[PDB]
Design a protein around this ligand. Structure first.
Ligand code: CLA
Ligand code: CLA
Ligand code: CLA
Ligand code: CLA
Ligand code: CLA
Ligand code: CLA
Ligand code: CLA
Ligand SMILES: CCCCCCCCCCCCCCCC(=O)OC[C@H](COP(=O)(O)OC[C@@H](O)CO)OC(=O)CCCCCCCCCCCCCCC
Ligand SMILES: CC1=C(/C=C/C(C)=C/C=C/C(C)=C/C=C/C=C(C)/C=C/C=C(C)/C=C/C2=C(C)CCCC2(C)C)C(C)(C)CCC1
Ligand SMILES: CC1=C(/C=C/C(C)=C/C=C/C(C)=C/C=C/C=C(C)/C=C/C=C(C)/C=C/C2=C(C)CCCC2(C)C)C(C)(C)CCC1
Ligand SMILES: CC1=C(C/C=C(\C)CCC[C@H](C)CCC[C@H](C)CCCC(C)C)C(=O)c2ccccc2C1=O
Ligand code: SF4
Ligand code: SF4
Lengths: 74, 34, 31, 135, 155, 141, 80, 742
């Protein structure tokens, strides 16, 4: 629901401050990224949110189905 | 008596395969050669 | 109960064959 | 470049490591008087009477700043692209005239001599380098 | 009564502020003589001291909070956890090194980082040193806690 | 019919529910009159009256009578709305008359709407019910 | 970069050029409309892709289109 | 300049002409609709008076008239509640037996089966049991019969009509100028003196003469009909002196400062009344006397027409320092020229105050027979915490609206607002760090506990019988509060609350209040609270500091406060507006306050509330299972949500069946929100295209053309239904559990 409800520009503005904090911190200055950190894209976020949604859907129901039947009948 | 294989394969599949796989893929996706 | 140890080792050595063949197919599909 | 940097006490919003490594931008303008404006990085600054020079991370920052310099009736603002080689190129306006006005000597770029419902189908252009919008 | 917060280098255009936390002479003393930044050190010497300190403190949470912390094998399990995590850190440093990494950044506090962290060889020397220092620091923390009863008994 | 449908008047579970009937209204015999009215339906083994909707005339009151009643009232509402929208599309500002109703136009239409089936059939046969597919907008295929 | 195209249903009302926050667009001379001007997009390397130009365009089914493409530092709008 | 009254006579004529013109107030809505977007814009812009006019004086006149309209509807609500207590209530039967009659107004009419909601609430009465605590308020007011409630409700109707007439009057007949509103020193003096201090002094007068004698005769247990009417405590002074012997001295020890004579009815007893479980009415009267004197004194600080006093501008300009530049120079012009800035401050601090009121009223129950009524104790706590959270998110919204619209860089130049703008990246990145730290070390400890308990390793949990996390600082503070009577507070007899210590106070066999012990589960849940508040603050503060600009979109304040995006470019810039931060923060406010009210409900039912044995043993409702089950997520699932929702789902065919219906209907509205949250409007507009085709086919297409909801409206509807469904779910759950077990 995080990926489905909160959309991109919030996260992009938040990651810009994390980039500032990393480039202004001492000893953590010694390393950084070869690829620039960005927020997930709009389609990517729909992908990731739907994937989470359906994995959680499947695993919740399969846990309930197996356990409720096998606690009664083995 | 082959139940000793799990104490080899599960730590391999949990640590050695991820570290080697991620190390190769990290060095590969950051390389400017291929 | 179960199968013998030698059968487990034969199954692992036989599984070396499609592992090598899958490595060759996955590298050939990459080019 | 020539100009005085506007008077403010600094911010965390300013130039980051991108300036020293790939690209930096600058806007210059001349002001009739000293007056308070709003920085694109957040905050209040004072422009000088006379020429100014304020460095910015992106070109869009200078276009937003020059958009609010229209509200002070300052219309001689110039934007420069600055590479770490010291190579300064003048980008806006690029012709010398603002792009809202037609100037001669400007050529059409990326004009399609058709309406937009007259693009080819994607299957008609499939397995080739061309897109449906390309000519 | 005067201002304490300044732009860095007297130029307000950078994303920078000289604050008391950022640019105190005591803070600038301390960060600049940490072995990451101390002048007059080879990359091996920096990695060796950084490793020694990190192995030493990383012994602690494995020994006192791990699964075996109530057994007689508690301190040795903590030593093995700290050495395994030092080895993982060394592997991460070597992958960072061999990725042709970007350069270390100067800041308000450190005006100029060492040339050790600017190329691949300085990072590889650092990581080779970090491994040795880390295993040594974890071993010295192991012997100072596991024999702490005897060391108190010598008094 | 199917799955143990006895009459309500013979079902012992219906007779057991009728003894503990709740009063629906302030009438002290709403529950008794409810079960006396429901006594002629068919009944599951739990005591509750099941409805049969296949269209037989023994059970016309289950679904056939409310079907005719709904379809008449719904055609009234829809035909009156269609007549009002068609009457206001010529009066020089149509959108303003959709949020502010002309009562002098709408109220004779809601009075006229009792005979919507005859009006709808005369609308159908004269070709005035539908617009042509070339007259109304579509999107590119 | 992104790709910004202009079609001949342009009427030269200059609104896309005013809408652009990164100076991608400009007005060039023409004879195809009453205003005698088109839009043109020479600086598409500075296109962020924000589609303000398409919002500003008044012709029914736009005379300017942005086709989003390969993302760069300028097109992602990154100040770092 | 002096504070005076200048009034325009007859600014706006009273006529029904504009009631026939919907959207007359906006110049773009006055053209009439073309699409259905117009209809929603008429409601989104109805109270946005900056879009109505650009003149601050007419904006201020509109605001001042609309306040009287709002006061009218609130007084209609309050007189309605008092009228239902007068007429449709078992209040007189409840006064005679406060421990066994359940409080009820709202008889339900007998139609389609709904008279099952008229439960046996005691006192020979059938109706819906109420949890709003009006019975206790009228009890503490000293109301003894229905006729006094009828008089109060009629007076409330008169006062509501008087407010409504005042709102007509100050917009059409006598409307104040701009400088009448900008006398903030005059308004603060009058509010602190008259609206707070004189009000609290008059209320102390009522408490001394009416509430305390009648409630003292009730606690003696006389009768409801033998207690005399309270004007017979003024006319016949001997009835006071029989109860309170300090009245025999009269008013002469007040003026001669012999105030120890008044110690019969102005006590400092500290704890609770053992008969009612409420606060002592003499403590409450003494409270209001002290508070009244302090407020009257405090309302003389500010300069008005006579030279003495303070300029608030001169106070704010002197509070600069070496870290903060010019300090608070310019903040006076922000708060005197922007109504949104004032609404931000008052909304944030009024919400914070309501959360304080909720924490205070459970632990120090003011009203007689309030603490033993566990349904009222649960419901008023959770009600005022929700009012607090909503008002705080409102204060963040109006701070961002100030920052977009009314922020002036010339006024706010090197002051504390300009300096927090210029280091907003440091603030927001450290708050990001804090939120991640608090998340890991609050929720990850629960995940550790889940996994260690599931792996059969409870010796590795963070609990009281394993690795411990004791709340040493809160335990120390509660020790200091237990030891305060006789020590640091020598003139107090009992502690302020029994929540810190002092022993079980039982009323009618049930616990009124007992010490709330704090342990590892309490440590964990307070850090859950710290985490969820800090994340909500991150979202709202980020939306206020970045309302005008970020690194991504520089000219964000040109786009407005409330806008969907700036296109799919720059990677995609969806939800960058300050409005969208209010949107995202409403969910985290919901998350935080749901965990707060769940903590409250299960901590009280497990460790405070319950029945007291005749020996003195406390037997709690859920039996002390908070200590070992509130430390995992499986425990909160099973032992709280699964176990306590047994009463809302078994509630059909009974008096609590409307709670089960609301439970399912709220799950419905909650799930129905997600269609609006997870989708976007391109789908819905394209579906409306084919439906408009089928209407164009049958000649039923409307001229007001159908549009899908705007991106902002889709988000607004989604969060409104998400909040409505989730809060109504917890409402029906709380009601049906606590009306059954407590
Ligand atoms: C799926 C593969 C996998 C496997 C096989 C293990 C195996 C183990 N985990 Mg691990 N873990 C995994 C995935 C896995 N983990 C993941 C995905 C997570 C994230 C949730 C964790 C999180 C986790 C935690 C948080 C902890 C473990 C611990 C442990 C150890 C259990 C205690 C014990 O018997 O050793 C007793 C320990 C010793 C005898 C000393 C360590 C010996 C190892 C092999 C280090 C030697 C390195 C060597 C110098 C090179 C064991 C070695 C515990 C532990 O002891 O870690 C140190 C512990 O604290 N695991
Ligand atoms: C995020 C919260 C959290 C925390 C605090 C812990 C804590 C713990 N877990 Mg655990 N766990 C968690 C989440 C958490 N878990 C989750 C989410 C899972 C997934 C299911 C597990 C699964 C798990 C398993 C399977 C096991 C544990 C175990 C343990 C214990 C030993 C681990 C250890 O050696 O740490 C090693 C820690 C470090 C190497 C680093 C510690 C970090 C340091 C202290 C930070 C210091 C920062 C410092 C203040 C900054 C300095 C400033 C500078 C200027 C000086 C420890 C009590 C083991 C156990 O026996 O339980 C008792 C075990 O077997 N955990
Ligand atoms: C004048 C009224 C009117 C009429 C005659 C129709 C007619 C129709 N609609 Mg419909 N519709 C209306 C209003 C109306 N619509 C309104 C106001 C909305 C927005 C809620 C819709 C939304 C809508 C959808 C989403 C769909 C239809 C569909 C359809 C078709 C199938 C029947 C159906 O599904 O009904 C269902 C209609 C509703 C549930 C809408 C509620 C009807 C309201 C309550 C009554 C309107 C009466 C009007 C306000 C009174 C004015 C009278 C005047 C004197 C003032 C049919 C052509 C379907 C279609 O295309 O299938 C081919 C379809 O999918 N309608
Ligand atoms: C503001 C708070 C409030 C609330 C929530 C209620 C709620 C209720 N009152 Mg009530 N009441 C209130 C204030 C309030 N009252 C006040 C201030 C008084 C004193 C005047 C009363 C006097 C009162 C009496 C005397 C009675 C109630 C009754 C009732 C109940 C049923 C009302 C009903 O069905 O009306 C029916 C609703 C309508 C007919 C709606 C009218 C629709 C119009 C057209 C809407 C107008 C819109 C547009 C502008 C035109 C209901 C619980 C009754 C009681 O039912 O229970 C036994 C009852 O007998 N009330
Ligand atoms: C707004 C507050 C308020 C009001 C209207 C009154 C009103 C009254 N008080 Mg009073 N009183 C108040 C607050 C108030 N009190 C407070 C706060 C205290 C505590 C200091 C007292 C203590 C007090 C005493 C001790 C006496 C009165 C008395 C009286 C009555 C006559 C006063 C008089 O002679 O002149 C009058 C009904 C006298 C009386 O006859 O009481 C009924 C009387 O003897 N008052
Ligand atoms: C709201 C309360 C508050 C708080 C917490 C502080 C906190 C502080 N002030 Mg301070 N200050 C305040 C209000 C406050 N101020 C006000 C209202 C004024 C009047 C404008 C000042 C004027 C002031 C001066 C003049 C100085 C401080 C200084 C300091 C620092 C203390 C000395 C130290 O640690 O070295 C400290 C951070 C001193 C400091 O460190 O400045 C560099 C210092 O010299 N303050
Ligand atoms: C003292 C309280 C107070 C006041 C006076 C205002 C005043 C204002 N707010 Mg505001 N606000 C408040 C609290 C307050 N707010 C709170 C608590 C929040 C947090 C949720 C907000 C969040 C907020 C936002 C996010 C926005 C405003 C805006 C506005 C302005 C225009 C609003 C308008 O036209 O109304 C229009 C009102 C409606 C269309 C009604 C909406 C229907 C509500 C949401 C449903 C309520 C459900 C109901 C209670 C329960 C179900 C009942 C139902 C089944 C019948 C106006 C200045 C807007 C603006 O731009 O300001 C300049 C804006 O965008 N406010
Ligand atoms: C919004 C909530 C803030 C709380 C966040 C907590 C940690 C964040 C700290 C970040 C450092 C910020 C840099 C400050 C900005 C800075 O310039 O600092 C300097 C500032 C003083 O500035 P000046 O001296 O210039 O101020 C003079 C004028 O500004 C007028 O005061 O000192 C602080 O305020 C530090 C104290 C904050 C410490 C918070 C104490 C909270 C007290 C809590 C009382 C609660 C009740 C307790 C009962 C037991
Ligand atoms: C400053 C400060 C602080 C901090 C502190 C800390 C942070 C510390 C740390 C500490 C530590 C952390 C330490 C460490 C140490 C270490 C050591 C002591 C080590 C050693 C090692 C060694 C000696 C080894 C050797 C070896 C061996 C044995 C073997 C072989 C190898 C080798 C050679 C390596 C505080 C905050 C409090 C306060 C303020 C100030
Ligand atoms: C509940 C309610 C109500 C009621 C209310 C009331 C009934 C009120 C009252 C009120 C009151 C009844 C008040 C009063 C107050 C008073 C006051 C506030 C007074 C004070 C005074 C003073 C301040 C004094 C002074 C003095 C001195 C100090 C000394 C010298 C002399 C003299 C005397 C001057 C109503 C109906 C509305 C509605 C519903 C609700
Ligand atoms: C479902 C959905 C819609 C569809 C909803 C629409 C088009 C509005 C809902 C229809 C209204 C409620 C119809 C009102 C019509 C008449 C007022 C009904 C009158 C009936 C009388 C009896 C009063 C969106 O438009 C949308 C937009 C953006 C993001 C998400 C969504 C989204 O999820
Ligand atoms: S997408 Fe944006 S940057 Fe590109 S041409 Fe349009 S308005 Fe300009
Ligand atoms: S997905 Fe929607 S809100 Fe997001 S950038 Fe696109 S149009 Fe805007």
């Amino acid at each position: 629901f995080m990926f489905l409800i909160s959309w991109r520009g919030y996260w992009q503005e938040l990651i810009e401050t994390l980039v500032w904090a990393h480039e202004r911190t001492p000893i953590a200055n010694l390393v950084r990224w070869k690829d620039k950190p960005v927020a997930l894209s709009i389609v990517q976020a729909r992908v990731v949110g739907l994937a989470h949604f359906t994995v959680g859907y499947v695993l919740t129901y399969a846990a309930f189905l197996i356990a409720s039947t096998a606690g009664k009948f083995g | 008596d082959a139940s000793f294989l799990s104490s080899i394969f599960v730590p391999v599949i949990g640590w050695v395969v991820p570290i080697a796989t991620f190390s190769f893929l990290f060095l590969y996706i950051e390389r400017e050669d291929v | 109960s179960s199968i013998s140890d030698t059968q487990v080792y034969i199954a692992l050595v036989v599984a070396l064959i499609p592992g090598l063949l899958a490595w060759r197919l996955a590298t050939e599909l990459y080019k | 470049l020539s100009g005085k940097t506007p008077l403010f006490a600094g911010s965390t919003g300013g130039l980051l490591t991108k300036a020293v490594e790939e690209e930096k931008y600058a806007i210059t303008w001349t002001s009739p008087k000293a007056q308070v404006f709003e920085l694109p990085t957040g905050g209040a600054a004072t422009m000088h009477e006379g020429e100014n020079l304020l460095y910015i991370a992106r070109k869009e920052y200078g276009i937003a700043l020059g958009g609010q310099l229209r509200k002070f009736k300052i219309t001689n603002y110039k934007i420069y692209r600055i590479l770490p080689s010291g190579e300064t190129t003048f980008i806006h306006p690029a012709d010398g005239v603002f792009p809202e006005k037609v100037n001669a000597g400007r050529e059409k770029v990326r004009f399609n001599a058709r309406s937009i419902g007259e693009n080819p189908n994607p299957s008609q252009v499939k397995f080739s380098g061309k897109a449906t919008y390309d000519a | 009564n005067r201002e304490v917060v300044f732009p860095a280098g007297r130029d307000p255009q950078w994303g920078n502020l000289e604050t008391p936390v950022n640019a105190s002479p005591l803070v600038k003393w301390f960060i600049n003589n940490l072995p990451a930044y101390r002048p007059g050190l080879t990359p091996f010497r920096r990695g060796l001291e950084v490793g020694m300190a990190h192995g030493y403190f990383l012994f602690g949470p494995f020994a006192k909070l791990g699964p075996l912390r109530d057994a007689a094998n508690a301190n040795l399990a903590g030593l093995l956890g700290a050495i395994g995590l030092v080895v993982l850190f060394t592997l991460a440093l070597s992958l960072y090194a061999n990725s042709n990494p970007p350069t270390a950044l100067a800041s308000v506090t450190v005006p100029n980082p060492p040339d050790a962290f600017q190329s691949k060889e300085g990072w590889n020397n650092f990581a080779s040193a970090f491994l040795i220092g880390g295993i040594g620091g974890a071993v010295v923390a192991y012997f100072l806690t596991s024999n702490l009863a005897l060391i108190q008994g010598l008094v | 019919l199917g799955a143990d449908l006895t009459p309500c008047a013979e079902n012992p579970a219906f007779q057991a529910l009728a003894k503990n009937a709740r009063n629906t209204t302030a009438d002290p015999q709403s529950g008794q009159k409810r079960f006396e009215r429901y006594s002629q339906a068919l009944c599951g083994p739990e005591g509750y009256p099941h409805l049969i909707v296949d269209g037989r005339l023994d059970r016309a009151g289950d679904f056939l009578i409310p079907s005719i009643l709904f379809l008449y009232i719904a055609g009234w509402i829809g035909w009156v709305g269609r007549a009002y929208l068609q009457a206001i599309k010529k009066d020089s500002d149509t959108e303003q008359k959709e949020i502010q109703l002309d009562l002098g136009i709408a109220l004779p239409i809601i009075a006229t709407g009792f005979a919507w089936p005859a009006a709808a059939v005369k609308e159908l046969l004269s070709g005035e019910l539908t617009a042509k597919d070339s007259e109304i907008t579509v999107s590119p295929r | 970069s992104h790709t910004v195209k202009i079609y001949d249903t342009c009427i030269g009302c200059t609104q896309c050029v005013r809408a652009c926050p990164t100076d991608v667009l400009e007005m060039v001379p023409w004879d195809g409309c009453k205003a005698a001007q088109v839009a043109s997009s020479p600086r598409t390397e500075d296109c962020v892709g924000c589609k303000r130009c398409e919002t500003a365009c008044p012709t029914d089914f736009l005379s300017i289109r942005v086709y989003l493409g390969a993302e760069t530092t300028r097109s992602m709008g990154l100040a770092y | 300049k002096k504070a005076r009254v200048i009034v325009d006579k007859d600014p706006v004529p009273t006529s029904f002409e504009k009631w026939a013109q919907p959207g007359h107030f906006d110049r773009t809505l006055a053209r009439g609709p073309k699409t259905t977007t117009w209809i929603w814009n008429l409601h989104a812009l109805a109270h946005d008076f900056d879009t109505h006019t650009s003149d601050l004086e007419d904006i201020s006149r509109k605001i001042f008239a609309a306040h009287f309209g709002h006061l009218a509807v609130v007084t209609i609500w309050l007189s309605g509640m008092i009228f239902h207590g007068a007429k449709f209530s078992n209040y007189e039967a409840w006064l005679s037996d406060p421990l066994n009659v359940r409080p009820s107004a709202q008889v339900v009419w007998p139609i389609v089966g709904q008279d099952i909601l008229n439960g046996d609430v005691g006192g020979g009465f059938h109706g819906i049991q109420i949890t709003s605590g009006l019975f206790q308020v009228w009890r503490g007011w000293g109301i003894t019969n229905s006729f006094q409630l009828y008089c109060t409700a009629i007076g409330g109707l008169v006062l509501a009509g008087l407010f409504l007439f005042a709102g007509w009057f100050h917009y059409h007949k006598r409307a104040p100028k701009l400088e009448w509103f900008q006398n903030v020193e005059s308004m603060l003096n009058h509010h602190l003196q008259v609206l707070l201090g004189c009000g609290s002094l008059g209320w102390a007068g009522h408490l001394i003469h009416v509430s305390a004698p009648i409630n003292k005769l009730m606690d003696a247990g006389v009768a409801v009909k033998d207690i005399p009417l309270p004007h017979e405590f003024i006319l016949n002074k001997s009835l006071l002196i029989d109860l309170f012997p300090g009245f025999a001295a009269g008013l002469t020890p007040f003026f001669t400062l012999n105030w120890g004579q008044y110690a019969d009815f102005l006590t400092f007893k500290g704890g609770l009344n053992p008969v009612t479980g409420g606060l002592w009415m003499t403590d409450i009267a003494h409270h209001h006397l002290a508070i009244a004197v302090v407020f009257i004194i405090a309302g003389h600080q500010y300069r008005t027409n006579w030279g003495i006093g303070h300029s608030i501008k001169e106070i704010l300009e002197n509070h600069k320092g070496p870290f903060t530049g010019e300090g608070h120079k310019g903040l006076y012009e922000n708060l005197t020229t922007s109504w949104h800035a004032q609404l931000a401050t008052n909304l944030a601090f009024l919400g914070s105050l309501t959360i304080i009121i909720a924490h205070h009223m459970y632990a120090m129950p003011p009203y007689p027979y309030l603490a033993t009524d566990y349904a009222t104790q649960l419901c008023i706590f959770t009600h005022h915490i929700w009012i607090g959270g909503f008002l705080i998110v409102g204060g963040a919204a109006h701070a961002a609206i100030f920052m977009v619209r009314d922020y002036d860089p010339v006024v706010n130049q090197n002051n504390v607002l300009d300096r927090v703008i210029r280091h907003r990246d440091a603030i927001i990145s450290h708050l990001n760090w804090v939120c991640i730290f608090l998340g890991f070390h609050s929720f990850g400890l629960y995940i550790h506990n889940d996994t260690m308990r599931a792996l059969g390793r409870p010796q590795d949990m963070f609990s009281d019988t394993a690795i411990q996390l004791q709340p040493v600082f809160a335990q120390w503070v509660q020790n200091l509060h237990t030891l305060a009577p006789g020590g640091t507070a020598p003139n107090a007899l009992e502690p302020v609350s029994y929540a810190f210590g002092g022993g079980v106070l039982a009323v009618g066999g049930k616990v009124a209040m007992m010490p709330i012990a704090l342990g590892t589960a309490d440590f964990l849940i307070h850090h859950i609270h710290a985490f969820t508040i800090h994340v909500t603050v991150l979202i709202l503060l980020k939306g206020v500091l970045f309302a005008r600009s970020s690194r991504l979109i520089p000219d964000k304040a040109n786009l407005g406060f409330r806008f969907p995006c700036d296109g799919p470019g720059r990677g995609g810039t969806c939800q960058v507006s300050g409005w969208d931060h209010v949107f995202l923060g409403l969910f985290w406010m919901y998350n935080s306050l749901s965990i707060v009210i769940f903590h409250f409900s299960w901590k009280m039912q497990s460790d405070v509330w319950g029945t007291v044995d005749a020996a003195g043993n406390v037997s709690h409702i859920t039996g002390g299972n908070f200590a070992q089950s509130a430390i995992t997520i499986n425990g909160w699932l099973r032992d709280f949500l699964w176990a306590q929702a047994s009463q809302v789902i078994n509630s059909y065919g009974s008096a609590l069946s409307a709670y089960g219906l609301m439970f399912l209907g709220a799950h419905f509205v909650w799930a129905f929100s997600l269609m609006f949250l997870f989708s976007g409007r391109g789908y819905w507009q394209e579906l409306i295209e084919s439906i408009v085709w089928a209407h164009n086919k049958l000649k039923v297409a409307p001229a007001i053309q159908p549009r899908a909801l705007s991106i902002t409206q889709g988000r607004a509807v989604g969060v409104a239904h998400y909040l409505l469904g989730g809060i109504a779910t917890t409402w029906a759950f709380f009601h049906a559990h606590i009306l059954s077990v407590g």
